Amino acid sequence: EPVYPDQLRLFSLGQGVCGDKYRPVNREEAQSVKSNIVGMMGQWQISGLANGWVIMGPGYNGEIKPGTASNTWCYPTNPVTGEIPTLSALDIPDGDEVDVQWRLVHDSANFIKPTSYLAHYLGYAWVGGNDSQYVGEDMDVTRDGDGWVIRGNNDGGCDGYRCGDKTAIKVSNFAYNLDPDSFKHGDVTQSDRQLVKTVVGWAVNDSDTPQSGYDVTLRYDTATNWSKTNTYGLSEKVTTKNKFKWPLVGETELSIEIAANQSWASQNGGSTTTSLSQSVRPTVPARSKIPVKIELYKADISYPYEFKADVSYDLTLSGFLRWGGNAWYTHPDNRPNWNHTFVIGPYKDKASSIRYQWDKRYIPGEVKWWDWNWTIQQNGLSTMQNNLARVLRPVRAGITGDFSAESQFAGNIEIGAPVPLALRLEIPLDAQELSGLGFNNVSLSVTPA
């Protein structure tokens, strides 16, 4: 009877008020799933719990403490019971696409048996080979065009009505979504921030009046370039759902964008030039000078990389449905030949979503395909739970290669304390030498703030 975080809903209806069919989450309940709630809150959010308590956002370290709030964390007065657990990922090593697929479809404990049992619990007939009396055993895995077919070996004769008609499980339409946030990196091959030049001098206030309200601005443009390799050919088909910026590693500042819906293997490098300007608005007492410095740096970095790409596929179950026991909502008794496609991965529509069908099973108007309550009655709640959690187990392929980047950047303009003379700039800049160091169109200017 745990509290299910994915059933929580926030209401903004006044002190301790919840919407219809919801009730306020109490402190014990909130504690039991604390990190999940906090992880659904804004940094400085503070939300009400029942009986004078409040739970705070991650900026407050997700504290539960007494208080009042106009918004309230709430939970179904009648929650959907026995959710399908989420299991830890199944990690498959980087490889070419065939070898990655092969590794998946030939896994007995993680793929063959779970999908077989699923076909079996749904009412599909003869999910098993002739040389075993158990479901999902003596299965034949064969390549079929761009996909794969799992199906009980059928050699020879067999005993049972229509035992020759073995149910087939076909895996197709593989896709691979790189998860930017799964980023991990090996040991930093090359790394350093080297000082290539320091621009140094003075800014002088010649007047007899404390001068201020004057900006001293350095403008310059530099190039950042980066490259990367892709260890294997799978990367030729992996994409990322949304554009993202390359992770920051080291102090070497970098601006690199990976494009959405573009072959990982097609984004192997680039160079960007950007005009940047930084300034300071110093107060310089009358008839004085202040020292000014600007450090210029070259930075580069190399390191082996690895992301995870979430592997999704369609599971098409085809075979005839057993008499006096199948899970189709009509419960057909004529042994019809049946075909159904589940999408293992990102949701596509209700008909093809085990998770959706499952969570809605107690709503008769939603039961338009499989009758999961029947599967539960026949095999038991935890049996259906453990099987589907294995069927739906996230599968992730590793995406590897080497990364390398190079940039040139200026440090901040730094100033020292005023010295009495014994806004005018005395700060030599050699355009040619700077250009040779990768800093172009460099200027230092004095203008009203």
Author numbering: 2 to 423, 441 to 467
Task: Copy text verbatim from the article accompanying this structure deposition.
Aerolysin is produced by the human pathogen Aeromonas hydrophila as an inactive precursor called proaerolysin. Conversion of proaerolysin to aerolysin involves proteolytic cleavage of a flexible 43-residue loop near the C-terminus. The protein is L-shaped, composed of a continuous globular N-terminal domain, Domain 1, and an elongated region consisting of three discontinuous structural domains. Domain 4 has no known function but contains the CTP, which is folded as 2 anti-parallel β-strands connected by a short α-helix.
Residue His-132 is required for heptamer formation. Our MD-based observations thus suggest that the CTP remains bound to aerolysin upon proteolytic activation of the protoxin.
